[PDB]
Amino acid sequence: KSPNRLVVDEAINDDNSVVSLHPATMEKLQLFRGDTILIKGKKRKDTVCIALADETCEEPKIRMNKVVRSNLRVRLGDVISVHQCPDVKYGKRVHILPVDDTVEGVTGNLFDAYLKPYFLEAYRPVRKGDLFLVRGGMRSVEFKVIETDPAEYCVVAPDTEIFCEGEPVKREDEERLDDVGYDDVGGVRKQMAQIRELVELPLRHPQLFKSIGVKPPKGILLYGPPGSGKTLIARAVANETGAFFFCINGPEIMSKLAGESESNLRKAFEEAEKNAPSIIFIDEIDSIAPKREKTNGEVERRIVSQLLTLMDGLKSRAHVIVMGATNRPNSIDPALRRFGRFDREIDIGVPDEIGRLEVLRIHTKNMKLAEDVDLERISKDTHGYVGADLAALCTEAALQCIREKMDVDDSIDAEILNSMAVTNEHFHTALGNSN
């Protein structure tokens, strides 16, 4: 099968049209830099991308963003086959329409706001049926390639007509491109790699441990202050693995009646086993299962014990990974840290200057920023900030930009939103109104 069969790895550069390969691999497959290649994925889907040389890319691997991955019906770690296509001719005309659930509330023409600066002197390969994401104007719009001339695939050149007449397309059997991924979690590089190593094998290759006599981890405890991205990391891991995501919420369980909280707790574990490979995320795990001395309620002790037995009763053959999250690790019941329950513990602290800059880049993706904007300087100033603190600073600087730039019905055009830039003055005003 080798060498055309390669392993799917993360992209350094987020471009919907570019895939990165090792220069020795491209030499073996006789592909030059800038050449358009045809990649074949799962569910009989395929796409066309620009192949680029990368020394940091592993020889048997391929670097590609979430858009390329979704268009190939693959996930990180899966295998695709790269093929060369000489039929790649420039586009005469392409029919592109948006996805209705990504244009809710959006007004004006989407060509001048999104598609025009997207394809401009980029010479993007385009294949019929593909879906791509364009960022700008405080949001991101998903677009489907309805038709291409010449048929099946073409390169969108400056002489290519981009036809956009028609009602937005409805979503079909393919997940949102705006869904949480590893590219949306910043400042936790080491912690993310640790979690990924523990979960990727049991969730991506569950049948593998049927042959091996090794039982993998079940429970993971995420530690860290509120808004440090514990919920985010869990959703990111579940989306990136294709694992079924069930979310248990500490207060949600504890708000229910006596007996109803237990019934909900067992039904949550039951559903995860049924839809496995799964990830059970217990948010605010200290609401349920706190220390024996701290809580004195009779039915409360019954819930802590219910959680422990549900963890014990869970088998490695069930293919369910339970993720607990708390900002109070020392308030949590020590019986949960037992072997067979929450064996491993990951501490997601406060992000450093570098980590904060990463987080700031994430929540400015769909935002037009001025040259006067220094995200490096903001990260230098925002010392005690967590992921949510930095995310809130961006949203505040965004709505400060909306008020300051726009005056005078309430539905604002996409072309106008995409043009307004957030300044250093908007970020300074947001910093002053934040603690």
Q: Which of residues 79-108 bind its own copies (CB under 8 A)?
A: 79, 93, 95, 104-107
The answer to whether 367 touches 323, Cβ cutoff 8 Å, is no
Q: Which is nearer to its own copies, 100 or 381 (CB)?
A: 100
232 binds, among its own copies, ligand ADP, none (CB under 5 to 8 A by kind): ligand ADP
Site for its own copies in 246-305 (CB under 8 A): 249-260, 262-263, 284, 287, 290, 292, 294-302, 304-305
Residue 124 dihedral angles phi and psi, to the nearest 5° = -80, 125
**232 is annotated as contributing to ligand binding:** yes
354 binds, among ligand ADP, its own copies, none (CB under 5 to 8 A by kind): none
Q: Does 187 bind ligand ADP (CB under 6 A)?
A: yes
Burial state string for 10-30 with b = 16 or more CB within 10 A and e = fewer than 16: bbeeebbbbbbbbeebbeebe
Distances (CA, A) of 412 to 141, 204, 368: 16, 43, 16
Contacts of ligand ADP in 222-261 (CB under 6 A): 224, 226-232
Q: Confirm or deny that 83 is annotated as ligand binding.
A: no
How many other β-carbons are positioned within 10 Å of the β-carbon of residue 87?
A: 12
Tokens 């997207």 correspond to what residue? 118
**Which residue from 23, 29, 60, 111 is in contact with its own copies, where contact means CB under 8 A?**
60
C-beta closer to its own copies: residue 35 or 308 = 308
Considering only residues 361 to 380 of the shown chain, the ones binding ligand ADP according to CB under 6 A are 362
233 Cβ neighbours under 8 A, 6+ residues apart: 185, 188, 191, 192, 195, 222, 348
Alpha-carbon span 163 to 160, nearest angstrom: 9
Does the annotation place 226 within a ligand binding site?
yes
Give the span between the Cα atoms of 416 and 419, in whole angstroms: 5
Backbone torsions φ then ψ of 335, nearest 5 degrees: -65, -20
The only residue of 68, 391, 397, 430 in contact with ligand ADP, by rule CB under 6 A: 391
SS (H, E, C) 82-149: EEECCCCCECCEEEEEEEHHHCCCCECCHHHHHHHHHHCCCCEEEECCCEEEEEECCEEEEEEEEEEE
- Binding residues among 325-364 for ligand ADP as defined by CB under 6 A: 325, 339, 359, 362
227 is annotated as contributing to ligand binding: yes
From the CB of 281, what's the least distance to ligand ADP, in Å? 9
Task: Report whether 230 belongs to an annotated binding site.
Answer: yes
Q: Where in 198-257 is the site for its own copies (CB under 8 A)?
A: 201, 205, 207-216, 226-227, 249-257
**Which listed residue (8, 188, 369, 414) binds ligand ADP by CB under 6 A?**
188
Tokens 């509330």 locate to 105
Least distance (Å) from its own copies to the CB of residue 33? 26
Interactions with its own copies, residue window 393-432 (CB under 8 A): 395, 398-399, 402-403, 407-408, 411-414, 417
SS3 373: coil
User: Directed axis angle between helix 387-405 and helix 353-362, to 10°?
Assistant: 50
11 to 40, contacts with its own copies by CB under 8 A? none
Residue 22 is encoded by which pair of tokens?
């090792």
- Closest approach, Cβ 360 to its own copies, in A, equals 16
Q: Report d(CA 162, CA 80) in Å as an integer.
A: 30
According to the annotation, is 186 in a ligand binding site? yes
Given ligand ADP, its own copies, none, residue 325, with its beta carbon under 5 to 8 Å by kind, binds ligand ADP
- Scanning residues 147 to 206, which ones bind its own copies (CB under 8 A)? 147, 149, 163, 165, 170, 173, 194, 201, 205
Q: Report whether 97 contacts 164 (CB < 8 A).
A: yes
Q: Which is nearer to ligand ADP, 228 or 241 (CB)?
A: 228
- Strands 79-84, 46-53: pairing is unpaired
How many residues touch ligand ADP under the rule CB under 6 A: the total is: 20
Task: Point out the annotated binding site.
Answer: 186, 224-232, 363
Q: Which residues bind ligand ADP (CB under 6 A)?
A: 184-188, 224, 226-232, 325, 339, 359, 362, 387-388, 391
Please give the annotated binding residues for ADP, written as ranges. 186, 224-232, 363
